[PDB]
Amino acid sequence: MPFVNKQFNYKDPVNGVDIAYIKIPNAGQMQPVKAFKIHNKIWVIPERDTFTNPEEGDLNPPPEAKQVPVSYYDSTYLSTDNEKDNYLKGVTKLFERIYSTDLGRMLLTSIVRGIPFWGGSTIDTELKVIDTNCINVIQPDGSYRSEELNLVIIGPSADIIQFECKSFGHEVLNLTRNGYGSTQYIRFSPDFTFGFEESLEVDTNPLLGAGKFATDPAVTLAHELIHAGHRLYGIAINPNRVFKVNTNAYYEMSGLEVSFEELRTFGGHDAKFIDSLQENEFRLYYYNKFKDIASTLNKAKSIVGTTASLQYMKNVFKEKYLLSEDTSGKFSVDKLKFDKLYKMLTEIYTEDNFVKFFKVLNRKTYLNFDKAVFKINIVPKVNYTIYDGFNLRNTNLAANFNGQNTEINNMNFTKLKNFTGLF
Numbered sequence: 001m002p003f004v005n006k007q008f009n010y011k012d013p014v015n016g017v018d019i020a021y022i023k024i025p026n027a028g029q030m031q032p033v034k035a036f037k038i039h040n041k042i043w044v045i046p047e048r049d050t051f052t053n054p055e056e057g058d059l060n061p062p063p064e065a066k067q068v069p070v071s072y073y074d075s076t077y078l079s080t081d082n083e084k085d086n087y088l089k090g091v092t093k094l095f096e097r098i099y100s101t102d103l104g105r106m107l108l109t110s111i112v113r114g115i116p117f118w119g120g121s122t123i124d125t126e127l128k129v130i131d132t133n134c135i136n137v138i139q140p141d142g143s144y145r146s147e148e149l150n151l152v153i154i155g156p157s158a159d160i161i162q163f164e165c166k167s168f169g170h171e172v173l174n175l176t177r178n179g180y181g182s183t184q185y186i187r188f189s190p191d192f193t194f195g196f197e198e199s200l201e202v203d204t205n206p207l208l209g210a211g212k213f214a215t216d217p218a219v220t221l222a223h224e225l226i227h228a229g230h231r232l233y234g235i236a237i238n239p240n241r242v243f244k245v246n247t248n249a250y251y252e253m254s255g256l257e258v259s260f261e262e263l264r265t266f267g268g269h270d271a272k273f274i275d276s277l278q279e280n281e282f283r284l285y286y287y288n289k290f291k292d293i294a295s296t297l298n299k300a301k302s303i304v305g306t307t308a309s310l311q312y313m314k315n316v317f318k319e320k321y322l323l324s325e326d327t328s329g330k331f332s333v334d335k336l337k338f339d340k341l342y343k344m345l346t347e348i349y350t351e352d353n354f355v356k357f358f359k360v361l362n363r364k365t366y367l368n369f370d371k372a373v374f375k376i377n378i379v380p381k382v383n384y385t386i387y388d389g390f391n392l393r394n395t396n397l398a399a400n401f402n403g404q405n406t407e408i409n410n411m412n413f414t415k416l417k418n419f420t421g422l423f
């Protein structure tokens, strides 16, 4: 029943299957890192991410006069075995919390089914996997074996609080925007969280509040998983598409813009900043990309490798994209089924909806200002549970989000930095 069937310990001996040393296709060299496969198609690497981007391998903080407003550095974080063990347990716990809700189960199911499309071959008659959608696993005999995967959760790079969902690009194909999809790497940490203010006028003001309430890390991870969903089905909105924030005088005076991809991901009223015309443009655009995939599958007659048959993969993608098949064995995209899937991934899976499911207090909009970053420890059950997060039932933290109240539940939060006023 649990999303993660085994309670991994960082020091568990490697087995070359679900506990192994691996290398990622960063187009560069790297020493293998210990990784854990927590569920079909999903791996966790308890390391700071100095791998996905070669230009971001230094964790040391730049000079104090060169650091930005909202940022937090600690070159030593996640460097010890005890930390990696806690990281692993914290991340698995958040996956369980997410999976325990119907929405999370739906999202995670969609993610597992969202296998990156096999469009790496130059011959339109043959289907071939794109190697950057795989990782290289060291087997018991010391040799490497290629394994396809959909998601990797890895520690943050230099700036500990800069969580994000990234993936390896293609020389010509825009994998996260052409319906293909690609393996997603989420920079994330369950050992820190952010503060926000309960009053909207305060939360959206850069000069007020210290961050009285703490964001539930499960929402934060879910937010990243939502991006992953968009990217795995190749329907992420181009980051150049932004909303000129004109509903907040403080954003305006700085010309701050926010991508539609972020507004969509948050959901709620934020999503309404993307007008009907533009929303239609995107929907039709991705509908066509799905059509191209359906045709590519029709033009397929061969397949590379023996890890599966042409017929097996054609079906695996028929399932992912929910395609239809006529008597002649041809695939096509059904408008109803497409709109349903597209809407599921973009409107049903949103931060705002996860808040409703977790029954937690959370920022009301993405268009606010950061307040502070806290150090936390969600692994101990006396601190945080799969079922209630910080608001432990049958305790003084059960009601009114008392568990997220950093003033009431002060023993669970250590403020590391305040961001208010620095903007």
Ligand SMILES: [Zn+2]
Pocket: 223, 227, 262, 265
């Ligand atoms: Zn985001």
